[PDB]
């Protein structure tokens with residue numbers, strides 16, 4: 001199936017990282033932050049992703065959205081990226097889906113820099129605390145199915161046949177984003193590398209971390225959005 005127009009045309013999503021464009025063909029999206037190298041003032045790395053445009057943003061509890069895709073990940077050992085997330089008005093996050101090869105405990109692998117990436121989700125509950133849940137593991141080159149649903153405040157994520165969801169902290173100007181947001185972080189110590197707003201600092205970080213590859217390919221993509 002071809003990538004929906006809401007994404008390709010910009011009717012719903014704004015692009016972050018113009019070059020190269022993620023649409024490599026009518027049916028494929030390729031996110032390569034090491035090439036797009038898009039930065040934001042508070043970002044901690046490089047990204048290549050789409051975000052629901054500002055004018056359409058409403059509260060999490062005021063929208064029904066469903067994002068689904070076949071996701072292939074090719075990345076160097078030790079890499080860590082966020083491939084989908086619900087962002088809040090300020091600097092807050094509501095939901096985040098990761099593919100990371102770090103030593104953070106609590107997942108199926110949790111062994112830094114060994115080529116086996118943990119795929120998990122972090123959801124911020126109504127008390128403002130994040131609850132994390134392991135979905136599966138994968139090695140570079142593998143593919144999995146991702147489905148994220150925000151049912152008017154109740155967010156659910158499914159991957160590898162595993163599902164987890166809870167009602168989340170509401171935000172009046174929330175917005176969904178997806179793609180490849182590569183995190184500048186040491187996989188062993190989890191310490192952040194680089195300086196905010198300094199692209200060259202992140203360039204050096206990824207070089208020193210040995211992250212020379214990070215490509216998230218998405219196919220069979222679908223996105224539904226109903227705001228009331």
Ligand SMILES: [Ca+2]
Nearest residue numbers: 101109111116
């Ligand atoms: Ca690992």
